[PDB]
Amino acid sequence: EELFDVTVIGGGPAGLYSAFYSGLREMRTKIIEFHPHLGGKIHVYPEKMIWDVGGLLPVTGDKLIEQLVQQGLTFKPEVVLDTKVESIIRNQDGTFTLKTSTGEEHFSKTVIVATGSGILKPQKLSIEGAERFEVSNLNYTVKSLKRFKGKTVIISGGGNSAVDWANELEPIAKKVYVTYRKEELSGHEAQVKQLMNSSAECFFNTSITKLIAGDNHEAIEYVELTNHETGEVSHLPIDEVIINHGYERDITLLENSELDVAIIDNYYIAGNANSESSVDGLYAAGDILKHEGKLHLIAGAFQDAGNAVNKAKQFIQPDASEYGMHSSHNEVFKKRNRELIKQMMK
Amino acid sequence: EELFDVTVIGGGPAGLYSAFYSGLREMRTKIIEFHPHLGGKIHVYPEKMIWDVGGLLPVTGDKLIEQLVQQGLTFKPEVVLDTKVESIIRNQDGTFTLKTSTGEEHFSKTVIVATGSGILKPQKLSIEGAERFEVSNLNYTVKSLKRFKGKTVIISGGGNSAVDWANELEPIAKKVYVTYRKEELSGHEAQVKQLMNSSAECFFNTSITKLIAGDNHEAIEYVELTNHETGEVSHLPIDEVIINHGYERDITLLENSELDVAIIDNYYIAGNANSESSVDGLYAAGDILKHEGKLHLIAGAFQDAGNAVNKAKQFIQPDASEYGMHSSHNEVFKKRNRELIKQMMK
Ligand SMILES: Cc1cc2nc3c(=O)[nH]c(=O)nc-3n(C[C@H](O)[C@H](O)[C@H](O)COP(=O)(O)OP(=O)(O)OC[C@H]3O[C@@H](n4cnc5c(N)ncnc54)[C@H](O)[C@@H]3O)c2cc1C
Ligand SMILES: Cc1cc2nc3c(=O)[nH]c(=O)nc-3n(C[C@H](O)[C@H](O)[C@H](O)COP(=O)(O)OP(=O)(O)OC[C@H]3O[C@@H](n4cnc5c(N)ncnc54)[C@H](O)[C@@H]3O)c2cc1C
C-alpha cells in the first residue's frame, strides 16, 4: 500500500529532525504541516538572535529555519504542507490512519506527534480586503530587523509582542508609530517605560480604518487612523505596517482522536525519556512531549526526535540496531559527501 | 573563596555546552580539559562531514570543534587546559574538591562530569625521537582531506581505523601506501576488499624502523621499511606520515575518587533523565552519562548538558527558575546582540 514507516505530524524543529533522522535510518518518511511553510514557532520570532542551539554560533531565527528545513529534507520525505491533521486512529492491525480537515487519509506504521503547542495563526486585520498587501508590506511578524532599516513603521495593537517589537525597531526604523485600541499599552511596566522615553510615538484609543495603496504600486503608502474617544480621522504616510492583535490557537488534534493516549494537563502527551507515549508505535517529540527530563529548548526537540525515531525503527524492524549509525561514518551519505568534498578542494 | 558554582571536567561537546549554559544562567563556571585543545572525541575525526547535529548543515569535524569552542566560551569561563583531574572529593559542607595530577586543587559548589570515554592519547611511534616530526608531517589523525590532496602518504598499522583513512584518501591523494605488521589487514572484509581494488599499495609484515628527515627541512622526506618475514630494508619517499597504532585510554577518574557515585558497567555514571548522579550536586553529561533515554549523539550531549546545568542552578539557588530563559529574549545577550545587529545593518 501507500503505507509509510514514519509519519511526522508538524514541521517545526522536532518534526524536521524526526524527518531527517528517520531518513538517516532509511525509513519511508512523511511530514504533515498545517502552514504553507515549514519551521514551527520560530516563525514567531525570526528576527531574534538564537544563541542556545548546540553547535550554532548565534543566528537569526530566519537563518535557523533555513538550516532546519534543509536538514529535514536531506532524505527527501513526502512533505504534505497546508494540511491540518484532524484525528489519529489506531487500526486493528496496529498501523495508523491520519485524517485531515479535508477527510483525506494517510497511513503509517508509526506516528511521531511533533505538534508543539499546536496550530498558531496570527489574528488577521478585520479591514475590508486587507489581504492584498500581505504580499508586500503588511506584516504579522517582524521577519527581519533589516527589512525595516530606515523605514517608517506603524504597529497596530498593544501589549502582546507589540511593546517588544517597537523596542527593537526604535534604533533601526526611521520612525516607529504604535496605535492601541485601549488606554494603557498592555505590556509589563518593565518594558513600557523604555518605550515611552524613547523614539516611539503612540496613539491611544485609535485603530487603522483603511489601508491606502499607492497610485503607482500596490504597497501601502498611507494609513487612515480613527480616534475612539474624540473622533478625529487622520492620515499617515508609512513604509511598513505590522499587525499585532494576538494569535489564535488550535489544539484539537488529540481530543478529536479516539486514542487511549495519556495526556498531561489536558494538552501535552505523557511520555517517557525515550519519547514513547502510552500507545505502541505512537511517539511525541518537541514541545508536545512532557516527561521529567524534557528540556524546553530547541536542543531538547532534537533529542526527543532522535529518541522517537530510534524507537520507531525497532518497532517496525525488531532486529534493527537500537541506535542510528553516526553520520560521519554512515555510508547513507556517501554520494552526498562526494560532491561536498569535491567543492572543498576548490 | 575560589569556590566556583559549576566546574566542568572535560572539554568536548558536553563540557563545552555545559560551560555555555552555565554562563547563560549566570553561574561562575570553570572547565578543565586534559588536552591543550578543547573539542573532545571530535578530534578523532576532524576530516569527516557531520550531518546529524540538530540545525547544522553538514560541516567537517574541524569546523564543528571551532563552532563548539566559540559557543562554550561565550561567557568567558575559567578554562584550565593541559590538566588531568585525578580525583573528586566531596567536602563535609557538600562542596567538592578536584585534585589534578599535580596536586593542585579546585573547589566547586557543583561538578558536571563530562569526561566522555576518558582521556584518549594516540599510541605513539616507538622510534627514537620521532616526536620531532609531529610539528611537521608526522600525524596521528587525518586533520583534513585537503592537507593530503595530490600527496604521497604512508599509513602505519592496519586496524579498522587504518583502512577507513586510506579509503577516504584514495580519491584525494596522489598515492597511498599502507604498512601492516601482521599478515592480513585486521579490518572487516567489507572495506578491506575496497582497499585492495584501488590505487592503494599495501605492505604486509612491515613496520617503520627509522624516520629519515630532509637535509634542508626537518620534516620526514624518506621512510625506512622492514619486512618481518623476508628481512628487506627499503626506502620510500613520502609527503605525509600517518600513524594508526590505536589509542591509550585513561578512565581512572572515578576509581581514584572516594565518592559514593553509582557506576554502570565499571565506567559510566548511572544517572537519571535529568543528568543527576547518585551524589547531590554532582552531574554527568555526554558519553559518560548512562540512563534509559540517553541519546548517543552529539545532539544528546546538549540535552544532558542543559539538564545538568538547570539542576545545578537550582542546587545552588533553590528559588531560581528550573528552566533557563530562552536566548532569543534573554537580556544576558543584550550587549552582544547590540554589536551583531550593528554589523547586520551593513
Ligand atoms: C517567543 C519564543 C522564543 C523562543 N526562543 C527560543 C530560543 O532562543 N532558544 C530555544 O532553544 N528555544 C526557544 N523557544 C522554544 C522553541 O520555539 C520551541 O522549543 C520549539 O519551537 C518547539 O518545536 P516543536 O517542533 O516541538 O514545536 P513547534 O515549533 O510549535 O512546531 C509545531 C508545528 O506543527 C504544526 N502543527 C500543530 N498541530 C498540527 C496539526 N494538527 N496538523 C499539522 N501540523 C500541525 C504547527 O503549525 C507548527 O508548524 C522559543 C519559543 C518562543 C515561543
Ligand atoms: C569515530 C567517531 C565518530 C563519531 N561521529 C559522530 C557523528 O557523526 N555524530 C554524532 O552526533 N556523534 C558522533 N560520534 C560521537 C561523539 O564523538 C560523542 O557523542 C561526543 O564526543 C561525546 O562528547 P563528550 O563531551 O560527552 O565526550 P568527549 O568528546 O570524549 O569529551 C571528553 C573530554 O574530556 C576530557 N577528559 C577526560 N577525562 C578527563 C580528566 N580526567 N580530566 C580532564 N579532562 C578529561 C577528554 O580529553 C575530552 O576532551 C562519533 C564518535 C566517534 C568515536
Cα of A18 vs centre of ligand 1, distance in Å, is: 14
Round to whole Å and give the CA distance between B97 and B215. Answer: 52
Strands A119-122 and A247-250: antiparallel
- With cell 513600557, the residue in question is A192
- Could you tell me which residues are beta bridge partners of residue B336? none
CA-wise closest residue to B203 among B245, B246, B154, B242: B154
Residues of A with CB below 8 A from B18's CB?
A: none
Round to whole Å and give the CA distance between B311 and B317. Answer: 10
Smallest CA–CA distance, residue B224 to chain A, in Å, is: 31
In order of A106, A140, A158, B221, the CA distances from A124 in angstroms are: 31, 8, 15, 72
Q: Where are the alpha helices (DSSP H) in A172-213?
A: 189-197
Amino acid (one-letter) located at A34: F
Q: Is residue A157 a contact partner of residue A246, using CB atoms and an 8 Å limit?
A: yes
Q: Is residue A215 a contact partner of residue A132, using CB atoms and an 8 Å limit?
A: no
Smallest CA–CA distance, residue B303 to chain A, in Å, is: 6
Q: What totals of helices (H) and strands (E) does chain A contain, helices first?
A: 6, 22
B14 is in an annotated binding site: yes
Cα of B124 vs centre of ligand 1, distance in Å, is: 49
B265 is in an annotated binding site: no
Question: What backbone phi and psi angles, to 5 degrees, belong to B80?
Answer: -115, 100
B59 in the Ramachandran plot: left (φ > 0), alpha (ψ -120 to 50) or beta? beta
Q: Where are the alpha helices (DSSP H) in B105-221?
A: 160-169, 189-196
How does DSSP classify residue B186?
-
Amino acid (one-letter) located at A310: N
Q: Which of B71, B268, B298 to mutate to test the pocket of ligand 2 (most atoms within 8 A of CB)?
A: B298
How does DSSP classify residue A239?
S
Q: Is A193 exposed, middle or buried (0-12, 13-18, 19+ CB in 10 A)?
A: exposed
Compute the C-alpha angle A52/A54/A57, nearest 5°: 70
Q: Is A180 exposed, middle or buried (0-12, 13-18, 19+ CB in 10 A)?
A: buried
In order of B133, B179, B222, the CA distances from B210 in angstroms are: 12, 14, 9
Long-range contacts formed by B335-344: CB under 8 A, 24+ apart: B336/A58, B336/B74, B337/A49, B337/A58, B340/A49, B340/A58, B341/A49, B341/A145, B341/A172, B344/A145, B344/A146
Sign (positive/negative) of CA torsion B269, B274, B276, B282?
A: positive
Amino acid (one-letter) located at A249: R
Nearest CA in chain A to B346: A146
> What was the structure determination method?
X-ray
Residues of B with CB below 8 A from A305's CB?
A: 54
Amino acid (one-letter) located at A12: G
Q: Is residue A108 a contact partner of residue A5, using CB atoms and an 8 Å limit?
A: yes
CA-wise closest residue to B309 among B76, B111, B117: B111
Q: Is residue A303 a contact partner of residue A274, using CB atoms and an 8 Å limit?
A: no
Q: Is residue A165 a contact partner of residue A242, using CB atoms and an 8 Å limit?
A: yes
Compute the C-alpha angle A121/A126/A127, nearest 5°: 135
Round to whole Å and give the CA distance between A62 and B270. Answer: 39
Quote the cell numbers at residue A199.
Answer: 523614539
HSE, side-chain direction, 13 A CA sphere, residue A57: 9
A41 is in an annotated binding site: yes
CA-wise closest residue to B203 among B155, B142, B161, B257: B155
Round to whole Å and give the CA distance between A112 and A19. Answer: 9
How does DSSP classify residue A277?
-
Smallest CA–CA distance, residue A167 to chain B, in Å, is: 12
Q: Tell me whether residues A345 and B61 touch, CB distance under 8 A.
A: no
Neighbouring residues of A331: CB distance < 8 A, sequence distance ≥ 6? none
Reduce the DSSP state of residue B335 to 3 states and report it: helix
C-alpha distance across the termini of chain B, in Å: 45
Round to whole Å and give the CA distance between A325 and A323. Answer: 7
String of DSSP letters for B61-127: HHHHHHHHHHHHTTT--EEE-S--EEEEEE-TTS-EEEEETTS-EEEEEEEEE--TT-EEEEPPP-S
Round to whole Å and give the CA distance between A178 and A346. Answer: 51
Sign (positive/negative) of CA torsion B181, B184, B189, B191?
A: positive
**Measured from the CB, is residue A298 less than 6 Å from ligand 1?**
yes
Considering CB atoms only, which of A24, A49, A333 is closest to B328?
A49
Compute the C-alpha angle B105/B111/B112, nearest 5°: 130
Q: Is residue B117 a contact partner of residue B220, using CB atoms and an 8 Å limit?
A: no
Q: Is B338 exposed, middle or buried (0-12, 13-18, 19+ CB in 10 A)?
A: exposed
